[PDB]
């Protein structure tokens, strides 16, 4: 969290079922949009940080 790495997403077919596969995953709440709308929604220049 001190030195957070950033990465940019493009030309991506994003399926979030694989995220639902992992039992340890416990945070799916989205500050942006409803998770159901997330599957239907499309974006550009998607930006992720870890």
């Amino acid at each position: 969290v001190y030195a957070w790495n950033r990465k940019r997403i493009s030309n991506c077919v994003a399926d979030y079922s694989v995220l639902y596969n992992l039992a340890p995953f416990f945070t799916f709440k989205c500050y942006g949009v409803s998770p159901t709308k997330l599957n239907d929604l499309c974006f550009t220049n998607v930006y992720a940080d870890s």
């Binding site: 639902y20 799916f28 409803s34 998770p35 159901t36």
Partner: protein, 50 residues
């Protein structure tokens, strides 16, 4: 946080239609019977006025 708004709707309502149902979302193929998780969430979301 007493005020609440419905985050999840199964089917878009009719004109002048009302929904009072409070059931955890069943988007998961497995029934989310009293279980809130991946593709499962009760439709109510707190307004949480600040």
């Amino acid at each position: 946080y007493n005020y609440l708004y419905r985050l999840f709707r199964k089917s878009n309502l009719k004109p002048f239609e009302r929904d009072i149902s409070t059931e955890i979302y069943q988007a998961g193929n497995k029934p989310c019977n009293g279980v809130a998780g991946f593709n499962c969430y009760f439709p109510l979301r707190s307004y949480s006025f600040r």
